[PDB]
Scaffold this active site. Structure first.
Site: not given
Lengths: 229, 175, 202, 202, 122, 101, 181, 247, 202, 202, 101
Positions: J6-9
């Site tokens: 679960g990422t926000s890159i």
């Protein structure tokens, strides 16, 4: 009363073991459809009429389960006729839309009737499309059936504001021709209806229309008899 | 099993022909109805239509015409739209007044296929659609009509053929 | 993933007393949309052999492709000798039978002249099985074609070509997948001849 | 598939072939990558237009680049057969390339070439070819310009180009997974491969 | 109707349904639309009365339901299953058609006296 | 468990609880309304018609003035059948009632 | 669970196969000159047979007249079809054999689990429906008499038990039990 | 409250009380007549209004049940208005939606009579206080004219009149009817007979007349499909009636 | 086969009223059934509804709410935006097990000026200064927060909505077409339409 | 039970380099297993990778890419960002049927300065001026487009990334924690960390 | 189809295609390597072991100098069993070969 479900379980046990277009123009609306009916891959009956008449100036054309489209359309036609007689008024297209969509919503879409309703009322011209689940939308031009995509391409390419009566007929007919050539479900001839605000609806049936005699006695007969009426 | 028989109807010149492979062809006055499918449904529908037509005759003092009977069957079939009758019926008859030969065919739930040339129903119909079209012609004589209808039925597949005139009906059997 | 498609159409083979005929429509189809109006569904493999694999096109084109390659190898190994119809039939059976548990979904027919010169037609089950037959049709509208012919056959190569024309003309009338063009290949000791006729567009 | 290009359309005219495709790679309902070129020139005489999985499209692209490299130590049909073999074999391996490919080009002898091939190996030629959603929208429109082979010589560059561009506008309006930006390639036996970039639909 | 001899079993004979074969426990597998469609009109009517109660108060639903009960209970015609003419006016169905109207739908238990007893609960 | 019929009477040797308990309630009502003991054929018939309506290999035995010694088996599916011999602590049944042996 | 029916020139012969051991299964007497034999699911099939017996008996008492076998067969067909309307079909097979006093001719009818009625010269259900037609069709004749029919039934039953019944006859004298299979 | 005693009961003389009283209401009602011609049927009546300010167009006593059938009444308007609404509805449920065509006149009259009869034995509703002259055309039975009374008894009539001037008009129709009457002649007779019965002013505004005759495709509202032909019931406008009167 | 409303809708309260905006594209899968739809539904003269989720259930509910409000209006005068939301909740919630309805309610009233109520698929009611819903709203959650301000003027709110829905249209293909906007203010209901040529280049 | 990232890159090219930014929260369902994770993985001194999708397959792939690049570096010197993307594609694509890997590659090289390559789950490679991925990226697609500009300076890009990831963190709970950023420039690799108290109030 | 054994020989009256065709290939090789006709027991055994490995109600008949008249049935599941009588155009089998009757 009504539809009974009298043999739903029995039938389950046994089992276990077209192109339609509507075009709105300046002074009215045009509805056109093909005339090929198919029982599966087979062409069950050519030259078929697909343009139903809800009222003199409100006409309907549908797809999906044929019987469902015929059943509801006739039922709504009676309500429109009764309501018009009750109110002594020319029926509105919106009236048909409300009862037509309310009726379909009542059956949770099990009545697979997808329809295009076009007509002219005292308040002007209208053109609606109805789904089996009751959802509806209003547009200047519409298309329905397996050949809808082919027909819509012609409509989108050529349609314009305030079309004339002659142009709309040509556009609708041309759109149906595209589905006839490019879709297998559509074929045969083209039925066109033109509804105008100040004129009677014109139903242009067949608007466009794109020996083995055996000698008598060949077939042997076991016996013959005469039946009395 | 007796289920799945084939029935065919054809229109001639002032005459119609209906044929089938216990009998699957029934008449209510001067209109003939042929039903293909489950035998139980065939028996049930006949009793229902006999019940309905008999009341129609008594109330109206008039025999039901094929055009009117066509709508009656369609409306009756649509009832039980959920869990319909596993039958494909065919109606053949001549209107008493106009004398125009009439034939029609239905699906499970009453879609009127009012073809002006010929009507077929039941199993093995897929073979019989083409054969009827290859052999069929418009305005056949009653004798010529019999040859065309019989040949299509026998080769496509005992067999029985009804030739319906205005005031005369001929029932024939085939090898 | 589904590895198998469908293309519709129909093929017909007739084993005349001396000549042989193989016919099929030219239309290619996918779920009610016309892919093309002229795709040659019948092929000539030489040596008085005409081949046609109906059904899944990608299975059919591969089978003819491999069969044609086998013919070339047969020529090299056998001093370029002609391939007999019976030899080709068993060769195709091994090709079809070589993929049992993942078979071609093609009802293929090969027509030609057997050794003595009579017309020859072999129809192959998708799993390889074949049988010599006087006349055979396969595909969507096959059921609509054979019954009509059987009435009128059970004849030269110009009056059967009439019946095939009418037969396909009848099928296209009541069947939607039947094509908008008819291909006919005629095999005789003279050679192989291709004839094309037009059908209904819609 | 995950990232997909919606549609390709093409049509053969009197002196060559035209092929067009929109420059969008859709991530499901998201119009993520609006810069994806999907027309692959493979020389001065052919273009390969690809739809479907973009990741598999880039795998096709290298094979085409290898094809020029290995040979340089091509024809439109030449390239198609290489692709068709790969597409068929990937299907036979139960590992398909989720793409539909149109190979447009002009043979060295002047013969026009348009062949389609999909993940299933199904192939067909036509005066007009379109993939995916364009098979139902553009193909009926283009067919009105060239309904048959006889119409090919009667269609000029301007008419064919106008029909293609018009089809894109209709395609863009009714296709949710489409983009206003598209690339158009014209291959002519005389003027060679003309390749137009980032055209605007209006 | 429960059996007179034993007041715990359905009267297989008087309840003409094709024998005891259509047993009670087996009327559970139903068409998904059967239950919703059978009492669709009732749900709409009750929902309509609720809105009247919310806006016009309890008086209006009381007046509407009392009028309907007056019409229904004063109308006894054992030779007709058709709805009363005044029932349509109150329900506002005097210019409407439905499949329930088009398709309204034995020697033993269809007699008039059967309805007289049920009408009066005698 | 088993039971059989003989000239001298009947021999018996070795959800269901309530249904038998509840059935004992109904026979009491029948024994009251008609003022005469419910026959075995009736009692088995009542039980058979119920297990059918609510689809319990129960058996019934008795000795009546007119019916005499009879044995009826009721299958869990509603099958009711009379039996001279039944097989699947001894009791003896007479017109005066059962006797614990 | 085998039920057989043979329509001889003056009677109808019905045969049926028999934890609980006894010393009249799958049969019910609807009328003095009508007999009904059934086979299929245990339980669901007997209540239907019992119900039919009550209705036919009720008609006889009401009119004091003997309902014809043809009418009885029709009544069973409608009730069986009416039963299946609101439930899943149940395996039932009914043979109605009766003597029509008004027409002075025997009649035999076969009703399938779906409610289809057939008038037959002979009929069978169960394991007897796979081979026995090979024998009856070869040996059955219209003018066969009662005593001949039981030789055929005794013959037929013999083949049934080789590849592997209580017998009743309906005649102008009424129902009759038989020990000679 | 499980029941309600019947309002209509037999008197010691054998007569039904409310029925006879209902007939009296029809008798005291405004006059209306009908004439069956060889090629058509005419139904006529005159409009009595509370005040001249009333819009005569809204006082429609003659009404359309089916395109080929029409009805007129004498007595209580509200009862007739309710009956027509049900009669039109019944014509669709019972016959059209089953047979696909409009019912014949005799059947529609029978179903209207059934509605009126069920009110003659009921504990809540008095019998309808109207008698309807139902005129229509059938493909087989041809032109017909029926009179249905509060009791539910309907009779076919060559020519009849109901209301205050029933006896005077019926005798006048007796002397001026024949099997050879033409529809145009029948209209002339109907206007005459209505003139003696009407009290006061006699024109096209106080009189409305409807005729069952030849088809009217102009009134169908659409063209094409010639098998579907127009309606037969036509309500003459006040303009047309005035022209007829001067002749 | 139920038609789900692919939408990008937005409501914004501002200084002296509220603005309701929505796209005009409705899609069945990848196909655009209609591109000129009017997703702004009027439940009352100063109360306007917008639908998300199934198009059938919401349309039925919207008609009932208009019926109930018209019933309420005839008795207690023009309703408030809060009242309309309450009506929606009763229908949406008590039928949540059967009806899949998501609603945004924006209205104007003298007592409370402009107000916005959003009703997600769960049936809950949340009063917010501004609300965004639909498939295309997921792509502007971070833009509306950064740019939204309280008590903005009509010009800023119109520009704010134009920019917000332009991006949702750009990234979400289920949403597109003309931006139809309704301005609810004491002056009266006002309608605005913005074509793609007017907002795309922003 | 595989752990999905679960990422926000986010990666953004700017005037004289490239900046790679990511959150620090990894979640198993609703639980935050670790809130100080270092999602910025180094494949080379001037090339940094960021992973999306399954945490196991991507970690295995990243090690191989670093191995291959280290192998390449010892032979042909420091690789380019394009080369690293090519290495990722081979592993990601040829193993797409077994490995669920989504990658963003940002690097600096003398020849091409800063570059960004994004590899969605499909395995395709797209070179972009800036790239955003992860669950939280869906909420800033409309914000990055409106605010991103070409050839921005370090301060603007750092502020631009801070604002962009603050909103993704705000709306997406699968992403959060500290904003760790890597600035790749000819001067050298630079590390930045921003705590919630520094960016939330923006 | 049926076949039986008798003093005078054997009587026969009336995927599978290839397997029988292919088996005809193997017997040719065996007829060559050993220079003597393959026995029925062997031929049936070969077929039985194959249908087993590739899980076709084939039968085998023959007449050999030593084996004599024998009939072997091979089930599609690999069951091999000898048979005096087999039942499921007449042929007669002798040491010189079959005779078409």
């Amino acid at each position: 009363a009504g539809l009974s479900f009298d043999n739903y379980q029995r039938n389950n046990f046994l089992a276990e073991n077209t192109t339609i277009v509507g075009v709105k123009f300046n002074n009215g609306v045009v509805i056109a459809a093909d005339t090929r009916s198919t029982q599966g891959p087979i062409v069950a009956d050519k030259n078929c009429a697909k343009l139903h008449r809800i009222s003199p100036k409100i006409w309907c054309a549908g797809a999906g389960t044929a019987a469902d489209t015929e059943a509801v359309t006739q039922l709504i036609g009676s309500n429109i006729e009764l309501h018009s007689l009750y109110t002594s008024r020319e029926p509105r297209v919106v009236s048909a839309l409300q009862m037509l969509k309310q009726h379909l919503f009542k059956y949770q879409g099990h009545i697979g009737a997808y329809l295009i309703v076009a007509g002219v009322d005292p308040t002007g011209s209208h053109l609606f499309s109805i789904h089996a689940h009751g959802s509806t939308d209003v547009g200047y031009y519409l298309s329905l059936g397996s050949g809808s995509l082919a027909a819509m391409a012609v409509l989108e390419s050529h349609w314009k504001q305030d079309l004339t009566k002659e142009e709309a007929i040509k556009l609708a007919s041309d759109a149906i021709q595209a589905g006839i050539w490019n879709d297998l479900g559509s074929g045969s001839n083209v039925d066109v209806c033109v509804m105008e605000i100040g004129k009677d609806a014109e139903y242009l049936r067949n608007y466009l229309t794109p020996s083995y005699k055996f000698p008598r006695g060949t077939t042997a007969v076991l016996k013959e008899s005469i039946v009395n009426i | 099993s007796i289920n799945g028989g084939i029935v065919v109807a054809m229109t001639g010149k002032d005459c119609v022909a209906i044929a089938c492979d216990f009998e699957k062809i029934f008449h209510y006055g001067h209109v003939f109805l042929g039903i293909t499918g489950l035998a139980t449904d065939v028996t049930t529908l006949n009793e229902m239509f006999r019940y309905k037509t008999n009341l129609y005759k008594l109330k109206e003092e008039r025999a039901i015409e094929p055009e009117t009977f066509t709508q009656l069957v369609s409306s009756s079939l649509y009832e039980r739209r959920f869990g319909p009758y596993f039958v494909g019926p065919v109606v053949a008859g001549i209107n008493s007044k106009s004398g125009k030969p009439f034939i029609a065919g239905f699906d499970l739930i009453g879609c009127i296929d009012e073809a002006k040339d010929f009507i077929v129903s039941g199993t093995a119909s897929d073979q019989l659609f083409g054969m009827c079209e290859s052999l069929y012609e418009p305005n056949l004589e009653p004798e010529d009509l019999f040859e065309t209808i019989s040949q299509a039925l026998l080769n496509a597949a005992g067999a029985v053929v009804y030739i319906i005139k205005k005031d005369e009906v001929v029932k024939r059997y085939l090898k | 993933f589904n590895p198998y498609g469908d293309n519709g159409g129909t093929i017909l083979g007739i084993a005349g007393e001396d000549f042989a005929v193989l016919a099929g429509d030219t239309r290619n189809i996918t779920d009610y949309s016309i892919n093309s109006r002229y795709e040659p569904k019948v092929f000539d493999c030489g040596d008085n052999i005409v081949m046609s694999a109906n059904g899944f096109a990608a299975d059919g084109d591969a089978l003819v492709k491999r069969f044609k390659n086998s013919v070339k190898w047969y020529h090299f190994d056998h001093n370029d000798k002609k391939l007999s119809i019976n030899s080709a039939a068993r060769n195709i059976q091994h090709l079809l039978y070589g993929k049992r548990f993942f078979p071609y979904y093609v009802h293929t027919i090969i027509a030609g002249l057997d050794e003595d010169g009579k017309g020859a037609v072999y129809s192959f089950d998708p799993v390889g099985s074949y049988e010599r037959e006087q006349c055979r049709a396969g595909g969507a509208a096959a059921s609509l074609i054979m019954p009509f012919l059987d009435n009128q056959v059970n004849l030269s190569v110009e009056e059967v070509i009439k019946l095939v024309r009418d037969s396909f003309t009848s099928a296209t009338e009541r069947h939607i997948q039947v094509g908008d063009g008819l291909e006919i290949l005629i095999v005789t000791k003279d050679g192989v001849r291709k004839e094309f006729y037009e059908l209904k567009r819609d | 598939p995950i990232v997909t290009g919606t549609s390709v359309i093409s049509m053969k005219y009197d002196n060559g072939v035209i092929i067009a495709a929109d420059n969008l790679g859709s991530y499901g309902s998201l119009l993520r990558f609006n810069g994806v070129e999907r027309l692959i020139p493979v020389g001065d005489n052919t273009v390969v237009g690809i739809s479907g999985d973009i990741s598999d499209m880039q795998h096709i692209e290298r094979l085409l680049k290898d094809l020029v490299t290995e040979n340089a130590y091509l024809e439109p049909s030449y390239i198609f057969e290489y692709l068709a073999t790969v597409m068929y074999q990937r299907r036979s391996k139960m590992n398909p390339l989720w793409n539909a490919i149109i190979v447009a080009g002009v043979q060295s002898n002047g013969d026009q070439f348009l062949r389609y091939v999909n993940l299933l190996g199904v192939t067909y030629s036509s005066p007009t070819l379109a993939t995916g959603f364009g098979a139902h929208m553009a193909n009926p429109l283009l067919r009105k310009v060239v309904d048959r082979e006889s119409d090919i010589p009667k269609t000029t560059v301007q008419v064919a180009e106008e029909a293609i561009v018009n089809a894109m506008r209709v395609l863009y309006y009714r296709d949710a997974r489409s983009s206003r930006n598209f690339s158009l390639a014209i291959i002519d036996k005389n003027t060679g491969l003309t390749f137009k970039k980032n055209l605007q639909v209006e | 109707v429960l059996s007179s001899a034993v007041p715990s079993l359905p009267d297989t004979l008087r309840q003409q349904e094709g024998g005891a074969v259509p047993l009670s426990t087996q009327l559970n597998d139903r068409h998904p639309l059967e239950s919703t469609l059978k009492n669709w009109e009732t749900t709409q009517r009750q929902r309509q009365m609720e809105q009247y109660r919310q806006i016009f108060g309890i008086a209006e639903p009381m007046k509407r339901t009392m009028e309907m009960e007056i019409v229904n209970r004063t109308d006894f015609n054992p030779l007709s299953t058709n709805g009363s003419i005044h029932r349509d006016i109150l329900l506002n169905k005097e210019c409407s058609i439905d499949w329930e109207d088009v398709y309204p739908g034995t020697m033993v238990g269809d007699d008039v006296h059967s309805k007289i007893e049920k009408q009066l609960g005698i | 468990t088993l039971a059989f019929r003989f000239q001298g009477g009947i021999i018996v040797a070795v959800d269901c609880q309530f249904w038998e308990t509840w059935l004992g309630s109904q026979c009491r009502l029948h024994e009251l309304r008609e003022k005469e003991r419910i026959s075995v054929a009736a009692a088995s018939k009542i039980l058979s018609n119920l297990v059918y309506q609510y689809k319990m290999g129960t058996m019934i035995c008795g000795y009546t003035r007119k019916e005499g010694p009879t044995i009826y088996y009721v299958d869990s599916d509603g099958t009711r059948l009379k039996g001279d011999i039944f097989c699947v602590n001894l009791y003896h049944v007479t017109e005066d009632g059962w006797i614990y042996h | 669970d085998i039920i057989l029916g043979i329509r001889v020139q003056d009677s109808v012969i019905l045969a049926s196969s028999k934890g609980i051991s006894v010393l009249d299964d799958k049969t019910r007497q609807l009328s003095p000159h009508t007999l009904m034999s059934f086979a299929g699911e245990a339980g669901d099939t007997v209540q239907f047979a019992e119900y039919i017996q009550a209705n036919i008996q009720l008609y006889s008492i009401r009119e004091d007249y003997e309902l014809s076998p043809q009418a009885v067969s029709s009544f069973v067909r409608q009730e069986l079809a009416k039963s299946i309307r609101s439930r899943r079909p149940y395996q039932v097979n009914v043979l109605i054999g009766g003597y029509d006093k008004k027409k002075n001719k025997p009649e035999l009818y076969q009703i399938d689990y779906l409610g289809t009625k057939v008038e037959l010269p002979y009929g069978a259900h169960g394991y007897s429906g796979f081979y026995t037609f090979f024998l009856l069709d070869h040996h059955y004749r219209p003018d066969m008499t009662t005593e001949e029919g039981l030789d055929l039934l005794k013959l037929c039953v013999q083949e049934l038990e080789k590849r592997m019944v209580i017998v009743k006859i309906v005649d102008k004298d009424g129902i009759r039990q038989v020990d000679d299979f | 409250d499980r029941y309600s005693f019947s309002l209509t009961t037999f008197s010691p003389s054998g007569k039904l009380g409310q029925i006879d009283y209902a007939l009296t209401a029809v008798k005291q009602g405004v006059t209306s007549l009908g004439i069956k011609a060889t090629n058509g049927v005419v139904i006529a009546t005159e409009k009595k209004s509370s005040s001249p300010l009333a819009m005569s167009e809204t006082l429609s006593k003659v009404s359309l049940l089916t395109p080929d059938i029409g009805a007129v009444y004498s007595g209580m308007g509200p009862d007739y208005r309710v009956l027509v609404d049900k009669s039109r509805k019944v014509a669709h449920t019972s016959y059209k939606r089953i047979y696909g065509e409009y019912p014949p006149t005799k059947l529609l009259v029978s179903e209207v009579a059934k509605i009126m009869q069920e009110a003659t034995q009921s504990g809540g509703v008095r019998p309808f206080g109207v008698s309807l002259l139902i005129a229509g055309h059938d493909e087989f039975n041809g032109f017909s004219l029926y009179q249905v009374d509060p009791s539910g008894s309907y009779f076919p009539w060559k020519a009849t009149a109901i209301g205050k001037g029933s006896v005077a008009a019926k005798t006048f129709l007796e002397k001026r009817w024949n099997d050879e009457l033409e529809l145009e002649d029948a209209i002339h007779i109907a206007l005459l007979t209505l003139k003696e019965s009407v009290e006061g002013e006699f024109n096209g505004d106080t009189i409305e007349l409807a005729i069952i005759g030849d088809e009217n495709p102009d009134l169908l509202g659409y063209t094409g499909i010639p098998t579907d032909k127009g309606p037969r019931f036509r309500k003459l406008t006040s303009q047309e009636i005035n022209d007829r009167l001067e002749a | 086969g139920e038609v789900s409303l692919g939408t990008s809708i937005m409501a914004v309260t501002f200084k002296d009223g509220v603005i309701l905006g929505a796209d005009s594209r409705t899609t069945t899968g990848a196909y655009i059934a209609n591109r000129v739809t009017d997703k702004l539904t009027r439940v009352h003269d100063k109360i306007w509804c917008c639908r998300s989720g199934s198009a059938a259930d919401t349309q039925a509910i919207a008609d009932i709410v208009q019926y109930h409000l018209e019933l309420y209006t005839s008795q207690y005068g023009t309703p408030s935006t809060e009242t309309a939301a309450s009506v929606f909740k009763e229908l949406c919630y008590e039928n949540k097990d059967n009806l899949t309805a998501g609603i945004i309610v924006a209205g104007y009233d003298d007592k409370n000026k402009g107000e916005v109520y959003t009703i997600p698929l769960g049936g809950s009611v949340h009063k917010l200064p501004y609300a965004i819903a639909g498939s295309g709203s997921t792509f502007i959650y971070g833009y509306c927060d950064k740019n939204f301000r309280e008590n903005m003027s009509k010009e800023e709110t119109v520009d704010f909505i134009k920019h917000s829905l332009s991006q949702a249209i750009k990234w979400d293909g289920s949403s597109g077409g003309v931006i139809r906007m309704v301005v609810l203010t004491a002056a009266g209901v006002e309608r605005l339409i913005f074509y793609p040529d007017e907002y795309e280049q922003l």
